[PDB]
Design a protein around this nucleic acid. Structure first.
Lengths: 50, 100, 98, 154
DNA sequence: CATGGGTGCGCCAGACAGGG
DNA sequence: CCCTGTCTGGCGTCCTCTCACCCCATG
């Protein structure tokens, strides 16, 4: 829901879900053209922490 | 109309779709002017060892419903009787008893 | 710029349907040549009606297919989608050649 | 011999990290210890001394290397590096047009209002450089003329 | 325009080492 | 293995009434 002004005051769970989906899309891209082990280990580790 | 003679028609379209349009090339240009030696003469021999079916001249074009061999109509696929009973029903689009 | 050639069996349908195919164009493209009729193909099949002898009783049939042209003027992307993608009237052929 | 290593930067400031890295090299004049810098990850041709490691982590807006450990960080275990490089080359490479086409051949549209649709080329015109293909719009294959580059061979 | 990158609390309690 | 020290977690009163302010930043 927005506030008086109009800027949407967004919840915290939308930040959490949007982070997990951004990282998951990056990791899938790192499965198609993909990239070396160290890269996908950091990518999966950032998804795990997300 | 003689269900065996319907079954004899359906096996002839299969053989015409397996051999010919693919083995009509032996008569297409290998019966045309080239090295017209025994290479040509072998090919004129080599299409009789195909079945006596599988040529499109063996196909009769019977009716799609009744299988009646005479009175066929190659716009609809029916005989002249089965096109008339259908048209007066309204099974065939844009057709009517017309006069000019 | 784009020939719109459309075919159907009914004349009251193909000519009704050509009114909105320019109303979906002149609303946006705002320039069409005009509704051009085309000479109709009348295919006749006169054939016997009895299942045996009496080959003098035949019934004359005729299937009339009509053709119309509007040949829209303006090739602006808006008009293109408003005709190519927006095809209406089932039972009416319409074929386009840009 | 200089082997490759992976550097993590603040994602978005990556070109500025690369420029600051080249400048820190030419400041602390370990010129014989750095080969290149390739572009959120920055590829560095390098050798491993602890001095050069402190140099790269003292470059601003750099988090650290990515490897097995932080004592002796890890060079390059190429697994999909070649695939990524090939994809980038093809993208930034000359896109071959779909000139080869024949009647009954399916094609793909990626231009105009027919974008994201497939169809077949009933007629072809090499002289007019135009393909006659119809695209199923509301089911009705709308025969339209598209250029070889306007559509892709299917 | 759109995304992503301090250093003043105190007790209980059980799990994890660490001697012992 | 039997006791001893450490290391992290879990927790701490209820209703109300105003106020002020909520992501830069930028090629």
């Amino acid at each position: 829901v927005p506030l008086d002004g109009g800027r949407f005051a967004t919840s915290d769970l939308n930040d959490l879900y949007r982070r997990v989906i951004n990282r998951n899309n990056r990791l899938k891209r790192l499965l198609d053209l993909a990239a070396p082990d160290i890269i996908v280990r950091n990518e999966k580790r950032m998804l795990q922490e997300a | 109309a003689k269900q065996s003679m319907k079954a004899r028609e359906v096996k002839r379209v299969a053989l015409a779709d397996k051999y010919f349009a693919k083995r009509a090339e032996l008569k297409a240009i290998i019966s045309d002017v080239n090295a017209s030696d025994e290479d040509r003469w072998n090919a004129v021999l080599k299409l009789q060892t195909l079945p006596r079916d599988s040529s499109p001249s063996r196909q009769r074009n019977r009716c799609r419903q009744t299988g009646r061999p005479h009175g066929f109509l190659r716009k609809f696929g029916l005989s002249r009787i089965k096109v008339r009973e259908a048209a007066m029903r309204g099974e065939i689009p844009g057709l009517k008893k017309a006069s000019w | 710029r784009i020939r719109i050639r459309l075919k159907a069996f009914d004349h009251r349908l193909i000519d009704q349907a050509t009114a909105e195919i320019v109303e979906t164009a002149k609303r946006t493209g705002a320039q069409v040549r005009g509704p051009i009729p085309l000479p109709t193909r009348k295919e006749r099949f006169t054939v016997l009606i009895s299942p045996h002898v009496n080959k003098d009783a035949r019934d004359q049939y005729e299937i009339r297919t009509h053709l119309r042209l509007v040949d829209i003027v303006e090739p602006t992307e808006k008009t293109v989608d408003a005709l190519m993608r927006l095809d209406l009237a089932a039972g009416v052929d319409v074929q386009i050649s840009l | 011999k200089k082997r490759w290593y992976v550097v993590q930067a603040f994602s978005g400031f990556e070109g500025r990290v690369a420029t600051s890295l080249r400048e820190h090299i030419k400041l602390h004049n370990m010129e014989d210890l750095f080969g290149e810098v390739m572009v959120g990850y920055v590829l560095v041709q390098m050798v491993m001394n602890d001095a050069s490691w402190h140099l790269v982590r003292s470059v601003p807006r750099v988090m650290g290397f990515i490897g097995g450990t932080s004592d002796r960080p890890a060079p390059i275990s190429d697994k999909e590096v070649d695939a990524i490089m090939n994809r980038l080359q093809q993208v930034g490479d000359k896109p071959r047009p779909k000139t080869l086409f024949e009647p009954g051949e399916m094609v793909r549209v990626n231009d105009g209002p027919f974008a994201d649709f497939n169809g077949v080329v009933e007629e072809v015109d090499y002289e007019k450089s135009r393909l006659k293909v119809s695209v199923s719009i509301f089911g009705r294959a709308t025969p339209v003329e598209l250029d070889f580059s306007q559509v892709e061979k299917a």
